Amino acid sequence: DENILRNAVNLQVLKFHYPEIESIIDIASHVAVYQFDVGSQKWLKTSIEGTFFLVKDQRARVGYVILNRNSPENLYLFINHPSNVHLVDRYLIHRTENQHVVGLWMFDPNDMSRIFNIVKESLLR
């Protein structure tokens, strides 16, 4: 099975960058990252675009890695509270703090809705 090999390989790539990552929860292929400017009231498209990995670290904290295929700089963020993630229109809006907002666009809308649910269920106690 192709997925067994893919997941094993991907986990080693993730662990090379972030040794504290314990497992991959789910994946989405073509994700683009946007950042919200607070004072300007405007969105900015970042240089980060690639494969999205929803992950768990050694302390079961939930987060995500975007492996940037364009440039070597990747992104690893935690999802600290389920209420910090909102499915707004075609985007996942992740607000870790009032002034610190990121937006994720996934090519496949089915990935966006599945990932939203998996985020919530991964944080469910």
């Binding site: 073509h30 809006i93 607000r95 937006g103 090519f107």
Partner: peptide, 14 residues
């Protein structure tokens, strides 16, 4: 491919 940043919502909460 990915939409222009201007297409993203600035809802009440944002």
């Amino acid at each position: 491919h990915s939409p222009a940043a201007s297409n993203l919502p600035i809802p009440t909460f944002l």
